[PDB]
Design a binder for this molecule. Structure first.
Ligand code: CA
Ligand code: CA
Ligand code: CA
Ligand code: CA
Lengths: 423, 4
């Protein structure tokens, strides 16, 4: 349960006092929370060109402590909104805000927002570590792996503002090897990281299909819209065109369909009749007949919602002697088969999917560092705790333990911080 | 979620 108190003397972070004059379009910010009897009200967003943003003190996630010297900790959403609306135009409001409590963080991520966050202090310390004779990598790793992705963007902004140099460029020149790969990956936003991992996977027609498949099969609609937008910004070409240029056959049709990020959203009602019909269609399209009707498989597995397809795959076992994964291995081959196997795993149990990919990257000789690094970077704020839970349950030892055996040095220490702990 |  999120922390809550009605006493200001028990709040965690730092306090900001603001004075805003009401404009024609209000004070220019939105708030969330205050429905549960014990829930903070926090700043959801700030209207640009509005009083709150132009003042410069208010920030997203801040807890509203008091309004016009009345403490509003514990007050309902409706009571506080009424206070702001009753203020006439030109009158002012006095706000005390508390900065340190986060908003909208995943419950299953391993990397949490640092509470006493000071972007300027972090940039200063990173610069000192970069300029140290024989780079101080420990400080660089200790900081960046203990900050959320959003905070790393603030660190990079404060670093560029002080030194007039990009933080990623300075770290690229100071770090090397697998440690450099991890740190530079942490510095990108989730969409920037996936977009550049996708571009790298399509270096030629001899494509690292594993990486393309892994990203496109495991990303959600929301994540794929931002990837498609950011990919075109960074590389001035649509992601779909590069997939079309880099794939062929039914494998191409499947990757293009998934990358659109237009999967049907999770419905409120379970459609039991469509569940049975989809299961029969998957059976009729494959195991039941000679050959395979691949477009029917692509259509059902790319367009239906994930909760729907989980029940479809269970109902499919009623008609077919083999489950969906085994049916795929019997019906198709090559990149098409690998893509269907990854997609079905992502639908059925995405944390287990990443746990198996982590095991494969380390089990044998050496390491598939590219796979291991990308997963530890991209899932550390999504579902890393479920990935660790599935890993320890299946393999007996923790993901932490396997990372220790396969990697060494500051590289290992960074991966262990992204892991989050032993199991 | 309410605008102010
Ligand atoms: Ca050094
Ligand atoms: Ca068949
Ligand atoms: Ca049955
Ligand atoms: Ca291996």
């Amino acid at each position: 349960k999120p922390f809550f108190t009605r006493n200001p003397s028990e709040l965690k972070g730092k306090f900001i006092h603001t004075k805003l004059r009401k404009s024609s379009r209000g004070f220019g910010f939105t708030v969330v929370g205050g429905d549960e009897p014990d829930e903070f009200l926090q700043i959801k967003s700030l209207v640009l060109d509005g009083p709150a943003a132009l003042d410069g003190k208010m920030e997203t996630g801040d807890v509203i402590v008091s309004v016009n010297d009345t403490c509003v900790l514990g007050h309902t959403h409706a009571q506080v909104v009424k206070i702001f609306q009753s203020i006439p135009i030109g009158a002012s409001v006095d706000l005390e805000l508390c900065r340190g409590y986060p908003l909208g963080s995943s419950a299953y991520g391993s990397v949490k927002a640092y509470t006493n966050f000071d972007a300027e202090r972090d940039a200063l310390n990173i610069e000192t570590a970069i300029k140290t004779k024989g780079v101080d990598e420990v400080t660089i790793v200790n900081i960046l792996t203990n900050r959320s992705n959003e905070q790393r963007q603030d660190i990079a902004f404060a670093y560029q503002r002080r030194t007039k140099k990009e933080l990623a460029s300075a770290l690229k020149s100071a770090l090397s090897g697998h440690l450099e790969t991890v740190i530079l990956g942490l510095l990108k936003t989730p969409a920037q990281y996936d977009a550049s991992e996708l571009k790298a996977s399509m270096k030629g027609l001899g494509t690292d299909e594993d990486s393309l498949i892994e990203i496109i099969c495991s990303r959600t609609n929301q994540e794929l819209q931002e990837i498609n937008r950011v990919y075109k910004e960074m590389y001035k070409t649509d992601l779909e065109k590069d997939i079309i240029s880099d794939t062929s056959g039914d494998f191409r049709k499947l990757m293009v369909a998934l990358a659109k990020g237009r999967r049907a959203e999770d419905g409120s009602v379970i459609d039991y009749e469509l569940i049975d019909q989809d299961a029969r269609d998957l059976y009729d399209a494959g195991v039941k007949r000679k050959g395979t009707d691949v477009p029917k498989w692509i259509s059902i597995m790319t367009e239906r919602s994930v909760p729907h397809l989980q029940k479809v795959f269970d109902r499919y076992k009623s008609y077919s002697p083999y489950d969906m994964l085994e049916s795929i291995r019997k019906e198709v081959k090559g990149d098409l088969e690998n893509a269907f196997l990854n997609l079905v795993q992502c639908i059925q149990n995405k944390p287990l999917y990443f746990a198996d990919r982590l095991y494969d990257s380390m089990k044998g000789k050496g390491t598939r560092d590219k796979v291991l690094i990308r997963i530890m970077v991209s899932r550390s704020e999504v579902d890393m705790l479920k990935i660790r839970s599935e890993f320890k349950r299946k393999y007996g030892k923790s993901l932490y333990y396997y990372i220790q055996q396969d990697t060494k040095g500051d590289y290992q220490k960074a991966l262990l911080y992204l892991c989050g702990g032993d199991d | 979620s309410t605008t102010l």
